[PDB]
């Protein structure tokens, strides 16, 4: 079973898994911090993300279709 | 007075007059029945 | 560009030019497959029959035909070679025809009859080809693919595994190495995806990338499918984006990228500005991709969602009944389920709950795991007065979706609304009621937990209102007030002006209950700022909130509530009281009015209470005849165990008890005290009457304890005066006196200052009489002076004037032990008080005292001289 | 002064009245806004599968030499392909941000 295809797939799999896991670990601690959390409080006050906001926002959209149904 | 009837139907009662009695804090007083009955039946 | 093209990768591109030899060696007739293909295959059929052309040229030209969008023409062309090539030469022709008919049965721009016809022609040519060459891999792959296209998935997997086994065996027998067949791997991965074995299918779809990154069907579509089903939308969208980047003419990749765009617009957006343009780009791409795929059920369902969120419910119904319903047997069950779900949503928004029920039921029939369809079904059951049925639906959904926030919210609101219902309180025992309250709190608090854990989501402000109601029903005012405040904050932390009138009003009522009325009036006025009923209600609330400050602001609002709505009992009670206790009334016009109000609402209880308080507390009716008659009437031939009137009867009966029938009356009062203490232990006044009975009959040990405890709740002048009474009886003065100044600084009661000063004379009696004290006696005398003054000034001519005067006389006598001047005033007042032996003693004692005090004063002056 | 205990009942204290809350149909359990809040989270997933073919139709008409020259060589792929980084990240395992 030791083909270049299987071994190549498995080692690329290993490398990408290691890269992605290490990236996930270093994300919250160090990458994006220093009061960017409070800009994600802007995300808290989002209209489309709270009750009734999805319709309202979608109602504001200019684009619309020419129906045939 | 129909508007007054609407007022009444839209009104709750936070404290009826028995609830009004107890005061600012609640003391247990659950022993008071036992002790009072005992001490005043000793005088009986 | 219908073929994958990447720099560096292989290419599975067809020969673009085929040249045919002429019969007998002028071997160059060029046929350019893009351009020189006649629209009539017979034109090349003549050329192919003339030159004794090979069988593969026929097949090559027909494949070039089919790969240019003319599958019917190429089918005809090979069908023209079937009666030319004969007997086992036509095997590969039947293989080609099988695969071409398979390709014709692929699309929703088709019919059930057309699909069945093409599938049947495919398997017919397949039987023909198996008759000749049953081991050629084209026919074996066509077998497995036919099984797949007929829905027989595990049968197809069985036959595919058997074919792979046979091929491995044949190669191992002849010594050659078996390379993986990409088509068998693809079929197996698709079948495993159908089996919901997403990890194995993912592994196969990923290995196909290494074996061939140009494989058309792009495995990346499958690896993205498996990534999605394994809860990794990021890599799924990434793989579909890659598949579209590699072949921009792949429509499945474009539709998957479109779905991913909608998903990312809904999740990754951090504000409405970003969302309104990401979703708009998604909608524009939807329009463009739809303009040439107008029979696509996914695009039609997307249009349905958009038109639902746009309020265009009729277009949703039209898309369902005019497009999806006609091609219903040809589309996958999940897409059908979602489109039916959106039709049901449209019905639900139009108020048609029967049709919405039917549509959500159909959607569940096509996909039982349609979570939002089941939620819509539960909500339809709610709307159709099927409450318990809806609760069963939701609680069955709860076994798998335990951390679903909206589901916890729904079940909590349902259970709470069931708890706050009077019918259920009448129908089931109390313990079940409290278990129901506890379950509602369980659901709502778990919802709050789940929503706060994901610190990005906003709390539905109502859950706090419902929790506060649940705690309010159980007389736990503290937690209810805290949750009402927590609702006010979050309520005002979004839309700062639209808080409902009732939140500020009820918060003000709670602030009135506990603590002073400074913030209560503020909130009441803030509610007044923002309905005819609310006006009367909060006007009574403001008038009731001022009775301690601007009493006369209360009087006016009470009048105009009674000047325009003369049936509000609370307004009239409090108005007569407030202006009565503010002295804008005489005792007669009280009675009249009060009697008018008394037997107006005669039968029931609140008014009666005020009535009792009138008679007993202040003016004319202290006579107990009416009291006995009416405070008994509150309980005659009713079952009412109510505390106020019966406690009044008990304690004012023990006032009469104050002598064998005296024993009788005392034990009657004790009985009633116990009886009212049974229903409500916190009844402070029953325990206070028991402390009275304990203190009165010389058992002033536990009575002082009970009073000390009572003061931890009650803070009136009455109970604290009772406290200081028992301390003077029981023991020495500071415990007695220490509480009398505290009485005076409790309330500005001008009648109890009279009540205080005589027993203050007693309090300074007891310890200046413990031993001669000349510095304490004089302040004793000062208090007694203020006593007599307060008793002469008022319209109170009780025994108090007489007794107050004497106590002062005795104080003067004992202080003479400006000494002679107080002595002379003592002589004067004691002569004014002129029993017999006492006044003859007064004569001899004047003769003694005036002279002897002059002697003491002259001796003092002589020794001050030196 | 004599001693005389008085259990002076309070004035019939009827405190301010409470007000019941009006309709809030957006927040009732029968509200479609709950389903929309859920849609924001799990929106288009029941659609990623387009047909039973999973968006991957098997053609055999895309392998040159197969259906015409009976040469089934391209069904077994290619040798020593060095995938681009975009294709190589796709080879990793799911849910690896944990």
Numbering used by the authors:
A (entry chain R): 502 to 570
B (entry chain A): 164 to 207
C (entry chain C): 2 to 531, 536 to 663, 674 to 832, 849 to 865, 875 to 906
D (entry chain P): 9 to 106
Question: What does the primary publication say about this deposited structure?
Answer:
The polymerase-associated factor 1 complex (PAF1C) is one of the most important transcription elongation factors that positively regulates genome-wide gene expression. In simple eukaryotes such as budding yeast, PAF1C contains five subunits: Paf1, Ctr9, Cdc73, Leo1 and Rtf1. PAF1C can regulate transcription through direct association with the polymerase or by impacting the chromatin structure epigenetically. The largest component, Ctr9, forms the backbone and shapes the overall architecture of the complex, while the other components join the complex mainly through associations with Ctr9.
In this study, we solved a high-resolution quaternary PAF1C of Ctr9-Paf1-Cdc73-Rtf1 from Saccharomyces eubayanus. The major body of Ctr9 folds into 21 tetratricopeptide repeats (TPRs) that wrap around the N-terminus of Paf1 to form a three-circled right-handed solenoid structure, with the Paf1 N-terminus just filling in the central tunnel of the Ctr9 solenoid. The rest of Paf1 extends out from the central tunnel and contacts the outer surface of Ctr9. Cdc73 and Rtf1 contact mainly the outer surface of Ctr9. Their interactions with Ctr9 were further strengthened by inserting a fragment into the groove of Ctr9 and making contacts with residues within the groove. Cdc73 without the α1 helix still formed a complex with the Ctr9-Paf1-Rtf1 ternary complex, while Cdc73 without α2 could no longer join the ternary complex, indicating that the hydrophobic contacts by the C-terminal α2 are critical for Cdc73 to associate with Ctr9. Rtf1 contacts Ctr9 spanning a region including the lower part of the N-terminal turn and the upper part of the middle turn of Ctr9. As Rtf1 and Cdc73 occupy different regions of Ctr9, they do not have direct interactions within this core structure. Residues 531 to 552 of Rtf1 form the bottom of the letter “U” that lie in the groove of Ctr9. In contrast, Rtf1 without the C-terminal tail or with only the C-terminal tail showed reduced binding to the ternary complex, indicating that the very C-terminus and the segment that binds within the groove of Ctr9 are two key segments important for Rtf1 to associate with PAF1C.
